[PDB]
Every structure is written in structure tokens, then in C-alpha cells.
Short mmCIF file of C-alpha atoms and ligand atoms in Angstrom, two decimals:
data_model
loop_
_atom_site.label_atom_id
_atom_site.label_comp_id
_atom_site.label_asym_id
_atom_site.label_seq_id
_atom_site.Cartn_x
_atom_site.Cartn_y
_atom_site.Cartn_z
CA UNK D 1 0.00 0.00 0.00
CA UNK D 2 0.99 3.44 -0.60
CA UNK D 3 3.72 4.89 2.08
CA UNK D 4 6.26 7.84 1.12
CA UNK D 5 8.00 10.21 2.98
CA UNK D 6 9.90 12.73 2.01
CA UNK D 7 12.02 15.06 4.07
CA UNK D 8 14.58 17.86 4.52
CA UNK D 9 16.17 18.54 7.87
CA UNK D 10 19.94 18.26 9.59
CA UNK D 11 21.26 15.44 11.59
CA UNK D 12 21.34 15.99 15.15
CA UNK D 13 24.26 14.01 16.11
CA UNK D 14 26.63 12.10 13.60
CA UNK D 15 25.37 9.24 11.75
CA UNK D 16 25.98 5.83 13.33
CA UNK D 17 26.98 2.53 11.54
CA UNK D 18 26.74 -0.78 13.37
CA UNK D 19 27.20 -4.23 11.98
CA UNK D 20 24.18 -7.14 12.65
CA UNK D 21 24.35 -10.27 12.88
CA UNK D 22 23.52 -10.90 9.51
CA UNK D 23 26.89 -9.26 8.51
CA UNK D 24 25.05 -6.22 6.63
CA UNK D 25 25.30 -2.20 7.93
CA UNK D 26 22.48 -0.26 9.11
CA UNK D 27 22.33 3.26 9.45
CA UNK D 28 20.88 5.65 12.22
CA UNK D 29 20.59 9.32 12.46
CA UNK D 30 17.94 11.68 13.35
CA UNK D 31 17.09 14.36 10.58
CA UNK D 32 15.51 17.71 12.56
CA UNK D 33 13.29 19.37 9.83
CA UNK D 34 12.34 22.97 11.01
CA UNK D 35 8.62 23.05 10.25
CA UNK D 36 7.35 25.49 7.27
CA UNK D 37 8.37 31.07 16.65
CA UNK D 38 10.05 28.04 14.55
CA UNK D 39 9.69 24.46 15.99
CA UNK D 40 11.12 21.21 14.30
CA UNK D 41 10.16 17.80 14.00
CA UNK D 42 12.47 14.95 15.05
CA UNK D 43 12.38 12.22 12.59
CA UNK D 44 14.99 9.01 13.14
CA UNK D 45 15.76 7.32 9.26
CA UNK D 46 17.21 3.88 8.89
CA UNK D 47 19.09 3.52 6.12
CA UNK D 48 20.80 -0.25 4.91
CA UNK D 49 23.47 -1.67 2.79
CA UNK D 50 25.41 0.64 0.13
CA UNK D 51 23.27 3.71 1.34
CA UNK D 52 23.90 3.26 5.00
CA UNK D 53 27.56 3.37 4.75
CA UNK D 54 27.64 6.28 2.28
CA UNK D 55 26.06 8.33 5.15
CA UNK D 56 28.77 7.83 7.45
CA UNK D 57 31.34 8.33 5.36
CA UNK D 58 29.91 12.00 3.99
CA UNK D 59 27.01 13.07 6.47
CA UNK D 60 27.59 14.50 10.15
CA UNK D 61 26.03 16.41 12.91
CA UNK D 62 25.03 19.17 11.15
CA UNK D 63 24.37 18.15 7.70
CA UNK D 64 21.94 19.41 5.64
CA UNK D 65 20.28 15.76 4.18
CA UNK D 66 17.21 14.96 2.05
CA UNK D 67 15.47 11.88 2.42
CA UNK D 68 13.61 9.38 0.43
CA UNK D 69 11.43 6.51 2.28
CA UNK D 70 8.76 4.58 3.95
CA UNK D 71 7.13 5.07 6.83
CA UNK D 72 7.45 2.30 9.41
CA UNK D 73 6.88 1.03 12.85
CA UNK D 74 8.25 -1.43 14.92
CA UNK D 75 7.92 -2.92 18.59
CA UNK D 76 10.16 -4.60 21.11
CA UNK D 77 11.38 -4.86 24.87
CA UNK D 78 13.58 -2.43 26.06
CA UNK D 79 16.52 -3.14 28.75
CA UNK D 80 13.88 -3.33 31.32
CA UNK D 81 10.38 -4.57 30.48
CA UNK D 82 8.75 -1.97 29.06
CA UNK D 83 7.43 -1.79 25.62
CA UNK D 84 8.56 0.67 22.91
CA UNK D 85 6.61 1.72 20.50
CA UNK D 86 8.77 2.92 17.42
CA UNK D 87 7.85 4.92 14.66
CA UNK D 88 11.18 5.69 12.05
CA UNK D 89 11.69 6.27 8.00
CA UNK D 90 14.08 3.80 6.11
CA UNK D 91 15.74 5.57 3.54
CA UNK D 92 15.86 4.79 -0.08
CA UNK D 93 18.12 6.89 -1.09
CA UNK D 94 19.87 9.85 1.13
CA UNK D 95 20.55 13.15 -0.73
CA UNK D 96 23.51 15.05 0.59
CA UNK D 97 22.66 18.72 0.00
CA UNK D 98 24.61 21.37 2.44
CA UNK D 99 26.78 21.40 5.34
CA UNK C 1 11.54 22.41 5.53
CA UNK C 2 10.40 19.64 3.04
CA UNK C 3 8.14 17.16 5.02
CA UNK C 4 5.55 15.22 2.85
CA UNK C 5 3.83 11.52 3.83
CA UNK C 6 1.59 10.26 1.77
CA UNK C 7 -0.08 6.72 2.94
CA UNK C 8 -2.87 4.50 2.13
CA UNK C 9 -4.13 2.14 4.74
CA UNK C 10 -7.03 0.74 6.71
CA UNK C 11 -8.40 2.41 10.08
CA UNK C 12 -7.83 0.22 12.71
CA UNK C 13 -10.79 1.37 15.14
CA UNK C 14 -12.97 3.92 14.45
CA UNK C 15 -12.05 7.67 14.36
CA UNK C 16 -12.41 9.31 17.58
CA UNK C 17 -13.25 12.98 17.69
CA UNK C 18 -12.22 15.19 20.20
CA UNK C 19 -13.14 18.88 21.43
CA UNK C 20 -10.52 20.85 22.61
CA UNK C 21 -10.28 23.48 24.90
CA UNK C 22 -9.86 25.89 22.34
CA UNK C 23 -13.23 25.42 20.92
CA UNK C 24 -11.60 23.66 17.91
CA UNK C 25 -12.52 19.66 16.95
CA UNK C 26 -9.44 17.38 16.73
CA UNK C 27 -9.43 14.20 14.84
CA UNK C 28 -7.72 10.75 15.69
CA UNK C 29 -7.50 7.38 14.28
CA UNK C 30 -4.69 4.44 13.07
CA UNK C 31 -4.21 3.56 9.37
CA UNK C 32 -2.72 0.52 8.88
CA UNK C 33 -0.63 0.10 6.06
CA UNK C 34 0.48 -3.43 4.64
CA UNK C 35 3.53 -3.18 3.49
CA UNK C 36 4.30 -3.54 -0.32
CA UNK C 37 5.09 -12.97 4.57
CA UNK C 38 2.91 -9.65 4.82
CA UNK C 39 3.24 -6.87 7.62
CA UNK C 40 1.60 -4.39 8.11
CA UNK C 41 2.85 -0.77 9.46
CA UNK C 42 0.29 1.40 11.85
CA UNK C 43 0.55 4.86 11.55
CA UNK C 44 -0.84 7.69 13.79
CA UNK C 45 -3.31 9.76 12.22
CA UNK C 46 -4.21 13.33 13.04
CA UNK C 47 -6.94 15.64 11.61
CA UNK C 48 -7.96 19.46 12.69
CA UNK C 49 -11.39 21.07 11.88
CA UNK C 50 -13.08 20.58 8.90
CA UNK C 51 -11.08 17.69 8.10
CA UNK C 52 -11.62 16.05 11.29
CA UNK C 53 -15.31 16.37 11.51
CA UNK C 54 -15.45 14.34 7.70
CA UNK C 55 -13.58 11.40 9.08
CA UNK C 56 -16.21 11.39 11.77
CA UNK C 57 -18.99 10.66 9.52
CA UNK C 58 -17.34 8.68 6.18
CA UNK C 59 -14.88 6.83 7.89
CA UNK C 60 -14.90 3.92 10.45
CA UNK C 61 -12.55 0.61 11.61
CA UNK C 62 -11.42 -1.18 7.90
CA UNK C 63 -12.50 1.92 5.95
CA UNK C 64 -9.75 2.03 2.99
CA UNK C 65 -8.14 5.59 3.23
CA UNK C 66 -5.43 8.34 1.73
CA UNK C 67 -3.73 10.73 3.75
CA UNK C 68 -1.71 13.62 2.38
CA UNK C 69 0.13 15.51 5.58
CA UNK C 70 3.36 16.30 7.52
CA UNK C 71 5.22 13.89 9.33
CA UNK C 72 5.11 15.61 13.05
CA UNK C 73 6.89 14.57 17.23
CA UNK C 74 5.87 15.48 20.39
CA UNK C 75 6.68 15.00 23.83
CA UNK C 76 4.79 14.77 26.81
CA UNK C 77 4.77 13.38 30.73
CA UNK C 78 2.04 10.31 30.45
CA UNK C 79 -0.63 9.12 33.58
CA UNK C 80 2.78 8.31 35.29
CA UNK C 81 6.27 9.86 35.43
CA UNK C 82 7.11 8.62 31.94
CA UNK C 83 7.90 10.90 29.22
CA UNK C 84 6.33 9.26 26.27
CA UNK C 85 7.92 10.84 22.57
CA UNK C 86 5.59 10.42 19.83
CA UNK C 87 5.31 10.46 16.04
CA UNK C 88 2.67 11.35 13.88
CA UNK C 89 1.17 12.33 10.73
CA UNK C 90 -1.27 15.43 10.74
CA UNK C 91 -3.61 15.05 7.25
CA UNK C 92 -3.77 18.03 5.17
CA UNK C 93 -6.22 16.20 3.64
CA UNK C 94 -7.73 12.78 3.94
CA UNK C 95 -9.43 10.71 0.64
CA UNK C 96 -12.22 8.30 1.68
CA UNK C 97 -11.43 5.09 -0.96
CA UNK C 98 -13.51 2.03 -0.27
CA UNK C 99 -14.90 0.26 2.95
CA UNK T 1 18.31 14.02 -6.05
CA UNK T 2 14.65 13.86 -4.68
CA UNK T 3 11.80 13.06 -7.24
CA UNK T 4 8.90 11.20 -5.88
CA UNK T 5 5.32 11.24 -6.87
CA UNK T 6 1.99 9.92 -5.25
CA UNK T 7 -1.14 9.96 -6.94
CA UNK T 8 -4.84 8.39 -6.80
CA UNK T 9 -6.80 8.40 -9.83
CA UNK T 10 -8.92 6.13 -12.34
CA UNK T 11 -7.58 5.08 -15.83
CA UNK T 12 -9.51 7.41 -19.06
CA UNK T 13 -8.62 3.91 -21.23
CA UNK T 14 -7.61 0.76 -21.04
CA UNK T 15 -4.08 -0.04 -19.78
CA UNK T 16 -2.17 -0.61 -23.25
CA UNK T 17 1.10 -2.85 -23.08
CA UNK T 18 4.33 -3.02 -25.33
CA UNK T 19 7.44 -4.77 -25.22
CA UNK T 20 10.91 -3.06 -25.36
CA UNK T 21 13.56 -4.42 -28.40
CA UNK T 22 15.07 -5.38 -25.15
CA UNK T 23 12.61 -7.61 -24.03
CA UNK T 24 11.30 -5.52 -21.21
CA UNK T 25 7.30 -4.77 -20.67
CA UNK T 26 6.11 -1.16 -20.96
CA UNK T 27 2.86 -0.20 -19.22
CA UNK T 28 0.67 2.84 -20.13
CA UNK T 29 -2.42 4.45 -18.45
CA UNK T 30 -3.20 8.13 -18.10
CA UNK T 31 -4.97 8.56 -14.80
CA UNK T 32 -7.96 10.76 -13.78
CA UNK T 33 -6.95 12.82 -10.67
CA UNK T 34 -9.57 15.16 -9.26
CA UNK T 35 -8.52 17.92 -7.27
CA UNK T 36 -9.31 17.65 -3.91
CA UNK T 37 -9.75 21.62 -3.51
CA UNK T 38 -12.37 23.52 -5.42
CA UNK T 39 -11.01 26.10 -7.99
CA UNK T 40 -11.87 30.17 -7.83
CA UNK T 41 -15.24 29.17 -9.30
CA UNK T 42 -16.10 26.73 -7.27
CA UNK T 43 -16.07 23.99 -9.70
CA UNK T 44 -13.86 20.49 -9.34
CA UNK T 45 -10.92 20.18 -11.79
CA UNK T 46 -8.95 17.37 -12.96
CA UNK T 47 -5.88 16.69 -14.09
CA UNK T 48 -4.39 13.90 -16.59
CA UNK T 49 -1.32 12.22 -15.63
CA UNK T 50 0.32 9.84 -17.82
CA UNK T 51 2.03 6.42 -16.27
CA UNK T 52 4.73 3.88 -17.33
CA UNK T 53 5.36 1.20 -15.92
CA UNK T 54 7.92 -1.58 -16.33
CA UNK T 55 8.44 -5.12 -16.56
CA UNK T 56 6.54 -7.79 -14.70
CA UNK T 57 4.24 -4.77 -12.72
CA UNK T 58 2.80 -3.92 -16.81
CA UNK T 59 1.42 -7.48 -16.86
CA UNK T 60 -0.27 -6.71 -13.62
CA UNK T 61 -1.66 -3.63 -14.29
CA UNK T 62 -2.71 -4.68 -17.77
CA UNK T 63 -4.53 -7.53 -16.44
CA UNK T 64 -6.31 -6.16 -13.44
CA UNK T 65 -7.10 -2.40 -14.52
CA UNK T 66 -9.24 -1.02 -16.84
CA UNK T 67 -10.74 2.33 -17.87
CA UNK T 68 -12.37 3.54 -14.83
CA UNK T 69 -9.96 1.54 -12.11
CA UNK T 70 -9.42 3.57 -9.06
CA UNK T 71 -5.02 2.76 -8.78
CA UNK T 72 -3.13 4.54 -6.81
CA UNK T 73 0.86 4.73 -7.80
CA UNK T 74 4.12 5.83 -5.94
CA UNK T 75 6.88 6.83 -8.64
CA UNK T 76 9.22 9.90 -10.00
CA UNK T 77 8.44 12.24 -12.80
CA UNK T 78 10.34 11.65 -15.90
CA UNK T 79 10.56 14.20 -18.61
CA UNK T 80 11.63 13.22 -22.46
CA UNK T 81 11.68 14.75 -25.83
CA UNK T 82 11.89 13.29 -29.10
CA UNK T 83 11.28 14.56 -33.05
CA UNK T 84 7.77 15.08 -34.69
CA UNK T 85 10.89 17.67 -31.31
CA UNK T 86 7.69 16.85 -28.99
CA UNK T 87 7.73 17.53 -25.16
CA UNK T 88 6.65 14.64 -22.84
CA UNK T 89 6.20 14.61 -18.82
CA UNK T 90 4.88 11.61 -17.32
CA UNK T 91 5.36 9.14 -13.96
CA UNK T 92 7.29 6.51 -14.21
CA UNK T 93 5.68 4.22 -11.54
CA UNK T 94 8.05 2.63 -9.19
CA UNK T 95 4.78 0.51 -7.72
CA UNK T 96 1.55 1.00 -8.05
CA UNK T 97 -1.85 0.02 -6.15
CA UNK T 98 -4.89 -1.47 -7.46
CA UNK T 99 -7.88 0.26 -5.12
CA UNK T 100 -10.66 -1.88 -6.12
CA UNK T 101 -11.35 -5.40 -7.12
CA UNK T 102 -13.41 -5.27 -9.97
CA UNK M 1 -7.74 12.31 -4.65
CA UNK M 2 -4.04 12.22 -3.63
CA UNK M 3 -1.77 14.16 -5.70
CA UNK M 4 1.85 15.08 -4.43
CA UNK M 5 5.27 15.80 -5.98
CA UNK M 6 8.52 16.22 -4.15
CA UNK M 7 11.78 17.76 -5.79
CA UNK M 8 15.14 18.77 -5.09
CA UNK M 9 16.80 20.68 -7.91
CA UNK M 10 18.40 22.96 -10.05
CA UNK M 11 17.00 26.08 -12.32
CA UNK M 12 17.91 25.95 -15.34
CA UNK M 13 17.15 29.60 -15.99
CA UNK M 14 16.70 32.77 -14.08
CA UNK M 15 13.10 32.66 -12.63
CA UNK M 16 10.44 34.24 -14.60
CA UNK M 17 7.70 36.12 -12.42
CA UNK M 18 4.43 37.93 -14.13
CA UNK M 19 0.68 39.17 -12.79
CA UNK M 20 -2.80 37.46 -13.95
CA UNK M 21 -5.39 40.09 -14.76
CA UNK M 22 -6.80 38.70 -10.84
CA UNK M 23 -4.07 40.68 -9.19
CA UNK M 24 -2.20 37.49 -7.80
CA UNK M 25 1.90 37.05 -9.08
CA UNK M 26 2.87 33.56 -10.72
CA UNK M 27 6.32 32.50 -10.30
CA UNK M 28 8.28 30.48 -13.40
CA UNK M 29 11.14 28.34 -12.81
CA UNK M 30 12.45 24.98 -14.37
CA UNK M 31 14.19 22.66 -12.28
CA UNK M 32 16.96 19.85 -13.36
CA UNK M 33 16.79 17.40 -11.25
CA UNK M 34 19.31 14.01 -11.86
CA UNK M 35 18.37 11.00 -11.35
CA UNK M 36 19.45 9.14 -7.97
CA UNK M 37 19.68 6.02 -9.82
CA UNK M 38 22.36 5.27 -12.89
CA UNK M 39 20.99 4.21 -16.15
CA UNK M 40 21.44 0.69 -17.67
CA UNK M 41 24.40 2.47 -19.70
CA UNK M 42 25.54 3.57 -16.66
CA UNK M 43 25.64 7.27 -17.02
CA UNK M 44 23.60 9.78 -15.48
CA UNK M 45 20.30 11.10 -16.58
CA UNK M 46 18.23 14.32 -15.28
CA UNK M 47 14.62 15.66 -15.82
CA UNK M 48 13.60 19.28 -15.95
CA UNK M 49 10.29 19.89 -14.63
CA UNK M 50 8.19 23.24 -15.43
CA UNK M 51 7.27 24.73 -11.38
CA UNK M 52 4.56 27.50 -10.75
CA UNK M 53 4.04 29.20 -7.67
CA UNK M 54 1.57 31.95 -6.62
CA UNK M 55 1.01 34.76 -4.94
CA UNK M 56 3.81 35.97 -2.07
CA UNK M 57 6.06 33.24 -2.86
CA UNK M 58 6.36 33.46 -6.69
CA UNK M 59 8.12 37.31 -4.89
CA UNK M 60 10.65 34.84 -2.89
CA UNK M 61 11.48 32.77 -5.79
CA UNK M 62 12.36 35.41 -7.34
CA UNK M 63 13.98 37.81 -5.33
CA UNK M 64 16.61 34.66 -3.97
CA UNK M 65 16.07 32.23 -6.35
CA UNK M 66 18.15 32.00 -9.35
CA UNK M 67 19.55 30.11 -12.59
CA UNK M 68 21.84 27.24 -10.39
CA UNK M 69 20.18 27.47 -7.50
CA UNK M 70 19.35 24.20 -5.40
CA UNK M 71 16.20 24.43 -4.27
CA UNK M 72 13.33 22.09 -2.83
CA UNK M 73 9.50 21.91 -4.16
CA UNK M 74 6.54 20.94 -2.55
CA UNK M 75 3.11 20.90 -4.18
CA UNK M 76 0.93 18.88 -6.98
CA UNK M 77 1.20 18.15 -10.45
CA UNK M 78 -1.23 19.84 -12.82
CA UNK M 79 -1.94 19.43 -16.81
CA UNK M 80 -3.53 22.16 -18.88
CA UNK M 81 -3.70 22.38 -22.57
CA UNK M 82 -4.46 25.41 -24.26
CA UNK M 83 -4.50 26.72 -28.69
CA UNK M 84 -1.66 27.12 -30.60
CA UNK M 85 -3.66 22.71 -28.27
CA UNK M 86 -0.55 22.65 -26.50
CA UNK M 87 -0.26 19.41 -23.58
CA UNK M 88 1.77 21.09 -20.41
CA UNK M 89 1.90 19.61 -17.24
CA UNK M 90 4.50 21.44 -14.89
CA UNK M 91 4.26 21.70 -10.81
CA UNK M 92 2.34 24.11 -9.32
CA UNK M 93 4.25 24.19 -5.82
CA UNK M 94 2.43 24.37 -2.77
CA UNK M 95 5.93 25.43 -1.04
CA UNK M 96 9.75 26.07 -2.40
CA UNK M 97 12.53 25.51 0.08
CA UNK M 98 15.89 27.49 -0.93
CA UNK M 99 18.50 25.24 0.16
CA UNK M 100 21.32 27.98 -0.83
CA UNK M 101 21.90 31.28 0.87
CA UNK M 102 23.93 32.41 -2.34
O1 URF R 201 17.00 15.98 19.62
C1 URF R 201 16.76 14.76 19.47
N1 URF R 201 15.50 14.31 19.72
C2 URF R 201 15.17 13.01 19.58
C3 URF R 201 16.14 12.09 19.17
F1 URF R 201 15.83 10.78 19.02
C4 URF R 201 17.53 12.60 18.90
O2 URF R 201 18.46 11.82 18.53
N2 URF R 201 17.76 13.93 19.07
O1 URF R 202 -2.96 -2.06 16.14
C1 URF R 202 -2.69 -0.91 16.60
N1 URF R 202 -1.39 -0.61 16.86
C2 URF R 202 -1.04 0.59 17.36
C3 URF R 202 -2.02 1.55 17.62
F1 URF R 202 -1.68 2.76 18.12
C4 URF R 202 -3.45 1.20 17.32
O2 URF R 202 -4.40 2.02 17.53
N2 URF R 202 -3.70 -0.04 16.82
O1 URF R 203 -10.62 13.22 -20.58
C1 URF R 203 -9.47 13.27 -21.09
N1 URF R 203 -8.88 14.47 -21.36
C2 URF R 203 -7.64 14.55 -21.90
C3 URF R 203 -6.94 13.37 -22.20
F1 URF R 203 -5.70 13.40 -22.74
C4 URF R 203 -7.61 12.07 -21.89
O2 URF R 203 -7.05 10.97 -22.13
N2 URF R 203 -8.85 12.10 -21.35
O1 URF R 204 18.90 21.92 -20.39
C1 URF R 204 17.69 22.09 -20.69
N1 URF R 204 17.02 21.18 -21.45
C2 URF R 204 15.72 21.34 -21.78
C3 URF R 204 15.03 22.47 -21.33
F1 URF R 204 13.73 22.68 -21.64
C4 URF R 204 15.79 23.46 -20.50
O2 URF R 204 15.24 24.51 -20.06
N2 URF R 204 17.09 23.21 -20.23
#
């Protein structure tokens, strides 16, 4: 079914890499997109394979980034037993536009 | 900043209108979106005025819908302590499809 | 750089397949999108989008829609010219949804 | 119905503002945008779409906006035809991001 997001904002920290079990990246930043008195929204994007490590090699805190995705949600356990409830973009492709 | 969503799904419950303190009516409901072995993805809906008043009456749980908004966060302190951070979609507008 | 499209509409004709010299499926409609916000007058508009599609999605959408199928379709906006030079825009559908069953 | 287009690019031009008879300014630009994704020859393509935008903003556009310019575009995708009839479709943009200060 239909799900696309896209989005302009600036990471808030610098992206992070890890490496899963599975022996593929996955990427994690959060993207803060001033809204269009200025608030902004805090979005956190996933991005995977050739695209996730891109982003840590060029993006940082700071980084002005567009962002192509869908829209998903996950749940799990947390490191006590409380549920969290996630809501987070995975990236198809992660435009690099300003510093 | 560019922030676009655009989703089709099915409402999980019914909507639930709100009044607000304001004076101003506040819609809610959950669109479920299966993604394109199936999962689905449940986003957080939210509609303001005139908007919100149509899902009232078209829409109800399983009702096939389109939303056009912005992806938006909040934070708040929950029943308890907790801080609970939250992401949502508020419709700009909101396409009834098929029941 | 960011392209992306989203659209809801119903097909004017029937979905009309080709094949590519290179073997690959080409899928056309042109979709029927109202506006959802009335114009100066007060009257509803539409507008006419025209879709491609590729490979093994073209079957699907050439057997399951028809003129009048409410689809919705997720894709980027592609713009070519070539000679009689004539200017085309249309959506190249990276997926697209068929809303009803028929 | 749903109707949405999202764009990061380039103007090819200067941007073109002019008045309708109504009163209300109408911004002209048209963007380049490449393609993410190579082709199957492996070089790299772009589109140019036609944007519109109205009223305050067509002013923006054109006081900060011009030919090179990386910008963003928010809005829906519209076709018109019109006599010598001509088949446009171009992007009438709800909102334009200028992602330069120049
Ligand atoms: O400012 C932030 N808010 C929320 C986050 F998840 C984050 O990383 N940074
Ligand atoms: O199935 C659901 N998951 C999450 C929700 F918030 C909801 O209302 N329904
Ligand atoms: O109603 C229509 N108007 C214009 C077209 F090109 C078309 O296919 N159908
Ligand atoms: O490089 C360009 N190609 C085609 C055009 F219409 C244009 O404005 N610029």
C-alpha cells in the first residue's frame, strides 16, 4: 500500500553505523526538519546496505540531508520490560545537499 | 523544511473525535498500512477542523483511506512519570477510498 | 536528487502494453486525478497524468485495470523529448496500487 | 484524490515572475533534477520539470532564487492544454525551500 515520505532537515548528532548479525550495515541518524516562533520535527531514518555506509562516510552532525522513504513502525522490549513503541523512515536513497 | 507523507491504509478502530479546549474539533485514528510474509505498518493519524469532523462521519474501523500531511513529534509526561515521545502524521487532507 | 510522486486516480482507457527491443514490458495508463480543492469558481478540476510502468508490474496492471480503475501509484516524474521535437512529462511508476477489485 | 510531488533541484534559468489580470503574481522556474539512480548504460540522466508558484512566494522565488540554484518543491502536479492545443503539465508548488543562501 501506498507509504512515502519525504524530508529535509539536519542530523542531530553524527550518523551511526553498526554491523548485525547478519553481517550487513544499518544506518541511524535523526534528521531535525524545522517546520514550514520556529519548531522542528524529530524524525529518526534507517538507512541499509550501500546507502547506510555512504552516510557515514559523507554526512555528520550538522548536515543538511534529504530523504527518500517509507514510513514504518516497529515494537520490542527495552533493557527493562517496558514496551517501545517505534515509529522511524528507512531511507531509499539519502541526498547530501549542504553542510 | 520539506516534510511530505503520503499513505494508504485501513483504520484500525474507528475515528475518535475530540473537542478541545480551544473550541476547535481534533481528529484521531490508526491507518494501517500493509507493506508492499505480509506486515503491516500502523501509523498515527491526526486531523484538525473541517477535516476532522469528515472522518467522523465517512470513515470507520477497515474503511480504505489516503492521507496527504506532515510527518510531526511530540513529547509529553504520560498518567505516570514517563515521558512518552511520539510520532505522527497530521492530514492536510484525507481521501475516503472504499470500505 | 529527490523526485517522488503519489497519486490516486482512475484510468480514461484501457491499460495498453508493449514490449521493449530489449525484451522488457512497458505499461501505459493516463490517470484521472480530481482535485481535492475547489477552484476560484467553485467547480472540481482534474488533471491527466500519464504512467509507465515496467516489466513484470505492466502485466499486472494490464490484467487487473481497466478504464475507470481507481489505482493509486508511488513513482518519479520523468521528462523526455523526441522529433515530430515533442515535449513529454509523465510518472514513471516505481509501484503501483490497485484500489478496487473489480 | 491524492496528488503530491517532491523535488530537489536545479534552475535551469533565471526565474520568470508575471501578474494574472486577478491581481495574484505567478512564479516560473524549471528545475533539473538528476536522477538518484544510474541508467542501464551507466551514465547519469536528469529531468527538468516546469514549477509554478503563486502569490507571495512566486516574490521569494524570485527575489533569492536564481539560474543554479538548489532548491526544494513541494506541491501537486497539474496538466492544462491550451491553442496554438498545447499538452503542459509542470508543478504548481504548494511550497519552495531554498537550500542555498547564495
Ligand atoms: O534531539 C533529538 N530528539 C530526539 C532524538 F531521538 C535525537 O536523537 N535527538
Ligand atoms: O494495532 C494498533 N497498533 C497501534 C495503535 F496505536 C493502534 O491504535 N492499533
Ligand atoms: O478526458 C481526457 N482528457 C484529456 C486526455 F488526454 C484524456 O485521455 N482524457
Ligand atoms: O537543459 C535544458 N534542457 C531542456 C530544457 F527545456 C531546458 O530549459 N534546459
Amino acid at each position: 500500500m501506498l507509504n512515502r515520505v519525504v524530508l529535509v532537515g539536519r542530523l542531530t548528532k553524527d550518523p551511526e553505523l553498526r554491523s548485525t548479525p547478519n553481517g550487513v550495515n544499518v544506518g541511524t541518524f535523526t534528521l531535525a526538519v524545522n517546520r514550514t516562533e520556529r519548531e522542528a520535527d524529530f524524525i529518526n531514518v534507517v538507512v541499509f546496505k550501500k546507502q547506510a555506509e555512504n552516510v557515514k562516510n559523507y554526512l555528520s552532525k550538522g548536515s543538511l540531508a534529504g530523504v527518500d522513504g517509507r514510513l514504518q513502525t516497529r515494537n520490542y522490549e527495552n533493557k527493562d520490560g517496558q514496551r517501545v513503541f517505534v515509529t522511524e523512515v528507512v531511507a531509499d536513497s539519502v541526498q547530501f545537499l549542504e553542510p
